[PDB]
Amino acid sequence: IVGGQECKDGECPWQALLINEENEGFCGGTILSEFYILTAAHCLYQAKRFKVRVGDRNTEQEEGGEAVHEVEVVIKHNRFTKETYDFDIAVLRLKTPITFRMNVAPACLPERDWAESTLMTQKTGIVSGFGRTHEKGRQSTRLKMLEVPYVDRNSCKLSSSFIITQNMFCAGYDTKQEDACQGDAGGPHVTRFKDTYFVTGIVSWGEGCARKGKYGIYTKVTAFLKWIDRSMKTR
Amino acid sequence: TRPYYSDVDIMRDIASGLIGLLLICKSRSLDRRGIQRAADIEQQAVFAVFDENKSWYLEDNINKFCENPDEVKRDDPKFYESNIMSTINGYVPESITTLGFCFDDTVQWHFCSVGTQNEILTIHFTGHSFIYGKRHEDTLTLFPMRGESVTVTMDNVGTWMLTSMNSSPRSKKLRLKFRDVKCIPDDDED
Amino acid sequence: SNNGNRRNYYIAAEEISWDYSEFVQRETDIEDSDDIPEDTTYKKVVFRKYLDSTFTKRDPRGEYEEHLGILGPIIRAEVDDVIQVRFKNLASRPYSLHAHGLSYEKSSEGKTYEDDSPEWFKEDNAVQPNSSYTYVWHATERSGPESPGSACRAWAYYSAVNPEKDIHSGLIGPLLICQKGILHKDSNMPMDMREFVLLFMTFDEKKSWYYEKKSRSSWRLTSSEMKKSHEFHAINGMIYSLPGLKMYEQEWVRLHLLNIGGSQDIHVVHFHGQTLLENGNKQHQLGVWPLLPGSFKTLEMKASKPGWWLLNTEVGENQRAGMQTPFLIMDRDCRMPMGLSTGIISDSQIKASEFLGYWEPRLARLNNGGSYNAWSVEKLAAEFASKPWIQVDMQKEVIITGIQTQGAKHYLKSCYTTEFYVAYSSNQINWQIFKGNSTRNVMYFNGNSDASTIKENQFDPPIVARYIRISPTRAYNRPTLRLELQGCEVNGCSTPLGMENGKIENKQITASSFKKSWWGDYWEPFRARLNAQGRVNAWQAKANNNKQWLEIDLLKIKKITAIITQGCKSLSSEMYVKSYTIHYSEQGVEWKPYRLKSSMVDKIFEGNTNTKGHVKNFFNPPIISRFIRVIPKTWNQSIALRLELFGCDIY
Amino acid sequence: ANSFLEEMKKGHLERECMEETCSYEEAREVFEDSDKTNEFWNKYKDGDQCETSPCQNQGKCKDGLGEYTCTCLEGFEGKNCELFTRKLCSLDNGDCDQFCHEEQNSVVCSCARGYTLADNGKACIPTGPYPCGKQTLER
Amino acid sequence: AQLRQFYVAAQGISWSYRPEPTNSSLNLSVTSFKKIVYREYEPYFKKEKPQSTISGLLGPTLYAEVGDIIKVHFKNKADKPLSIHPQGIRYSKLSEGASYLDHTFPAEKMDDAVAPGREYTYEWSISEDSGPTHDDPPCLTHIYYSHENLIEDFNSGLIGPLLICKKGTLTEGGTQKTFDKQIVLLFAVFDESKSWSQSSSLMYTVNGYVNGTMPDITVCAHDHISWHLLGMSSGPE
């Protein structure tokens, strides 16, 4: 989270801290149900052993609502290839039941047609997580959130040396230093609609953090809503 | 967009099948494969006018292989008009299938208004709009022997018209029913 | 969406008898033979919106739209706007409504092509007559204007049942998409930047609807009948000398000239002494522009010099075919009393419809002094505004932009004006009513705040009229008014060149011999200023004889067009001059006579018969000189002078 | 002040407005409340225009100075409330709280899990204490 | 800022449109002769300044930087009362050079039609507005044209290049200091029908020469050319 400000207590409930063997978040987590956590499938290449400390608000110290949850199994996409930049999504079934409480409330799927007609057609989107407070600044001690706007397809294509597929879309600022960064690995990025935030995607890659001419390479949630549900029912 | 053709006889050979086209690319991520392989690259719109009674192979084409005797038939009821035709990329407008693409796509075009139009033509997309640097056209005029390379933000579902606002009876039936659907393939295996 | 900004444009396509070229035929032209073949008043279906979803009252066309001509109601709105344009066809044929570059779908598109969709997606494509089928399209970034370019992006709308057959017969209206923070939510025009939308091409009748060809077969050739030979190569349906094409000098105005397909009808619009400005990411400067068909061009313009200049396309064949206008340029600053307090306005011009008894227009025009110092009637009219208007004749359609109003309170009786409107007309019949800026049909200015308290009102488009009626809409108590107008002289240099303000220095001029004393000090030249008071040594000759002069040595040759004079303080007498003569030169050694170009004898310029009344004197031969000897030829009492000249600099 | 004794007792409705012609300052002295003074004025000058009541479709009618106002209820619109309100998911999500979808080219709505569609057919009633999107702002 | 005393005189020329009379000599060409084209003259019209062979029918190139005042003496040596009207210069009505219903004075109308064999000093003070701007090449291109007959004068000639350049880049001779050479290009569809003499001249003219008979042009390699492309004709061409 380059720049930005802290998630107020309860403002980012689905947001989770995937605590690894050393219990420090190697990835941004996303509460999905009483037993499920969402992260990008890139997080699977960074794990010795890992848990989900839902409700965490400060990496410095435990300050309320921190319940440790253990991933039962990961639903990795079978077409998930790093080169495609696509399907970078890993649904994390949990052994420990997620207890819906303060700072614990997931983000569920809207109508696929309505999501395509409304979610990706919005103006800005909100990203949260214990991310790098600057492009390279230190990881956000507090749970810091940030809002980023949508980017046109051609702008993302010219702004990327690589493919901008039918799903991936840029979101951020042309030169302003504010976006998701190291710490938002699978960090939940949402979009407000009548106070109901909708996860419109999560950065996968990109040149630096909110660099000049660069943007977060988000994943079109509406593209794989059917796959998101089928992985909700998978494993 | 910059074309190429022959030199042995410009008039009769352009009237013949001697024309081609390439792109002068400032592109970076192409590697001869694709300018930026993230937008559709359907590019060519060539409403060129060819008179087969002006072609270099007028003789064999018109005379030996038609339903008429071996006369050139410049003078005519309409054969100066029949053998002349404003085909679209080697295909006549009346016998071209409708286009079709799925949504969320951008089609990177590289047009070529090369035909002897003698009158600038103004294409138009129903609902869908063009790009011109920053400007958005939605109705683009054309000029002879010039390449036009822009994209289109195809943003309206269903079939839509690649129609011309000039709509002169000379080159009137120019409307391509390009479709737009929400990318039917659910992919992702299951 | 949530963007709102919904505008109930109750548009109605009306098969009206639009006057294409009735204008230039009303000015001069040949007296023999016939006029333009038909009156060019062909019954054609054009866009004229109503202001009712009932569609019973038509939304009237206004002063800002007088230069639009045939151009219908402009759908002008800012970015991110949905507009509830309700279209109720009033023509005969079942028409439709298709715009270009808007958020329209098959349920809101005017094109009845093979969209392959149900009748929800076909009702728009064919709207029956007599039927209010609303249209709603959203403004987007693609449709919006350019941040380095213009603040509005132009488009077009039309019935697309058979567009070639539809726009011909007038199914076309101006369509501009602006960006936020330009138009007021009260009424939709840009206050900051003046825009102008025009269409300088031919308009085919052959494709026109109601062209079940009516007066034909009389063409000697295909290039004979102007219906289908010269298909109105025209500015806005008008070919030559379109009125309303007038603007201030040295003021920025935005261009929105458009061209619509057709057949390569290009027009390099020549401007006589004008330079354009590209509005975009580069902001270049242009002299003319080729009117490219199928393209919409927007620029910015700042006029150079006042007066008449010719609007024309530099293409000679198109210019002789239309696209012609002698566009006049007004003076940039026009705030100057034409009279009514200075005595310049003749009292005959100062007339009111009715009286009350010692409540007369002469009392009204005088802004100060006098017990009964206003015109009045018993009360305001009840059935309407219908006030006993005070008509202001001028014998000339001068340029008027400003006006100052006040009442009068006396004998503890306070009476003034609470609101008023103005009726103007070149003749005394077509009494046009001023309007600009407002949703209200005409203007209703607030009058004056309090009796004997001066208040000023302004006119956004400067109306021109030889006769000007003023019937107030509502006045406080009994009517009571003290007034004085503001403006500038029409189609000429009317600027203060000095000798009343600080424009002309004391050293600039010289006189024969000034009066001087020991107690009252001197009575110099170079103090002769239209309103000089206190130690008013305006100009008093010590010799007090005709041979005294006032030599005006200007810093350079200047184009003086007029002069006034009233005289200095009464001084327990009436001391002034009766008449004077003008001798000019470029070096002073000459004194080239000024007269009605008669001979070496100067025309006897009458001075100021009073010491307080401005006496207007005009210059039919425009004075061009720097050394100007003004000889006070005739004087009743000692020479006095409080003057002001008019004109401009030659360059 | 038709009679100079109008403003010596107080602004009197009869003595100033009925027996004489109350100026709006003296009309205030009668009322000293702008809204009621204007409502009185509306028919004190040009009568009523609501009595015509062309406000179709139960449109509530408001009279003013020489004017009436057909304020149309939902499902009705126009000058005299003669047009049904067009329901489209394009604008304001078809007035649906969460989700809209045209069926028969008409708005019918739906809600996410943890929410239920209200009886209006557009609003969403949250059935869970920690539902979708809704921040758990207990404090 | 410099005061440009220009001396140009319209004069009919029996123009051949051939690059040279060639070994055949003489002039037996299209019947487009006595073409009144104004040509630059030495100060006080001592004699006509020489014209480029490439600029056969092309008139006097008039470069002008901002701030100048151009004392364009126009001795109407052509036997017709004529005029010269610029296009994109904010001029004064005294040197307006265009006759129409402007309701102006005869002194501001004498420019609009100057008598034959009579010098009129067409004076116009150039301004920074009348000059190349930012994002604008160092020179700008315009035209002064005979407003006496916008239809017939063109085909009878009366054509001259108008160029406006920035200060500094403009040389004394009119070239750009950043540019090795400057080239002016013109095409026309000269028709004798709308001319002084009458003929059906469908003959096309690039610059002063007909249908591709230009004397050839030699340009040294790596020469920074500041081109000047001009396309004017009666109809839409």
Ligand SMILES: *[C@@H]1O[C@H](CO)[C@@H](O)[C@H](O)[C@H]1NC(C)=O
């Ligand atoms: C519609 O109304 C107009 C007048 O408002 C009328 O003249 C016309 O005939 C009507 N339309 C028909 C009969 O199709």
Ligand SMILES: *[C@@H]1O[C@H](CO)[C@@H](O)[C@H](O)[C@H]1NC(C)=O
């Ligand atoms: C004129 O436009 C302005 C722009 O702000 C608006 O405020 C105003 O109400 C309009 N009317 C008048 C009478 O000035």
Ligand SMILES: *[C@@H]1O[C@H](CO)[C@@H](O)[C@H](O)[C@H]1NC(C)=O
């Ligand atoms: C000369 O060509 C160079 C090539 O880059 C360009 O920068 C420059 O603008 C050109 N000059 C003009 C006047 O166009």
